[PDB]
UniProtKB/Swiss-Prot annotation:
Changing residue 169 to D: Induces a total loss of function at 34 degrees Celsius. Abolishes interaction with SBA1. This is ATP-dependent molecular chaperone HSP82. Induction: Expressed constitutively and induced by high temperatures dependent on transcription factor HSF1. According to PubMed:2674684, it is constitutively expressed at low levels, however, due to the specificity of the antibody, this result is unsure. Belongs to the heat shock protein 90 family. Changing residue 80 to S: Reduces client protein activation activity, leading to growth defect at high temperatures. The lineage of its organism: Eukaryota, Fungi, Dikarya, Ascomycota, Saccharomycotina.
Length: 213
């Protein structure tokens, strides 16, 4: 059974602002997600300094990108610390965010959407290219949960009984808009990573499907 939660008022405003933007440099969504993944990996690594056993649910530290062309989906996975149900509910929607309103005001004044991460709300950049998102996350401290939003005023959180098991970490599953299908292509993905993510401490893996002939 799913639980439904309302987004804090300014977050809803932010999403609507981002979803309805003709902005021309949307590719920065990937830098933001890779940067979040790297933060989550830094955190499990730092945490394991004083408790090495935390790594054992997923001993490999990586970032993995998987296009699913036939579903028009792009997944970005990490084996970082992941988030508990309570963390997902608290930190991804229901509580007011330090920087939401200030980022919107900066946008109004001519700021580049690229700046969104400097305001601590870069997660929401995913709506530049996706009209719907599932975030699937497994923390060592909780079960696997699915957070979902179509940028309306509410999101859902559901115990996960339908997706592959994550040993530990997070999968961002982006349902791409029809005009943003370029991010399913191996070539384009590599371009964006090389442009915006030159310096990442963790391996970035790209999953590519090809017909044998
Ligand atoms: C500094 O930490 C960051 C914060 C505080 C954030 C709540 C910390 C979070 O608290 C539980 C965990 O400690 C941390 C491990 C989880 C991630 C980095 C998630 O990503 C992945 N791969 O786990 C991230 O994206 C799904 C979650 C939403 C982040 C928000 C709404 C945002 O817009 N930008 C942010 C980017 C950050 O790095 C942000 O606010």
């Amino acid at each position: 059974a799913s639980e439904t939660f309302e987004f804090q008022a300014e977050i809803t405003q932010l999403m609507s602002l981002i979803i309805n933007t003709v902005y021309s440099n949307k590719e920065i969504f990937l830098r933001e997600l890779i940067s979040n993944a790297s933060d989550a990996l830094d955190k499990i690594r730092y945490k394991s300094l004083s408790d090495p056993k935390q790594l054992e649910t997923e001993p490999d530290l990586f970032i993995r990108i998987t296009p699913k062309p036939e579903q028009k989906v792009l997944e970005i996975r990490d084996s970082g610390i992941g988030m508990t149900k309570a963390e997902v509910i608290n930190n991804i929607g229901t509580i007011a965010k330090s920087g939401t309103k200030a980022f919107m005001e900066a946008l109004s004044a001519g700021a580049d959407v690229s700046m969104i991460g400097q305001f601590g709300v870069g997660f929401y950049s995913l709506f530049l290219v996706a009209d719907r998102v599932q975030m699937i996350s497994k923390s060592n401290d909780d079960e696997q949960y699915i957070w979902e939003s179509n940028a309306g005023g509410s999101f859902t959180v559901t115990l996960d009984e339908v997706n592959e098991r994550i040993g530990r970490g997070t999968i961002l599953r982006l349902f791409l808009k029809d005009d943003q299908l370029e991010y399913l292509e191996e070539k384009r993905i590599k371009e964006v990573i090389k442009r915006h993510s030159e310096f990442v401490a963790y391996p970035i893996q790209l999953v590519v499907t090809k017909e044998v002939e």
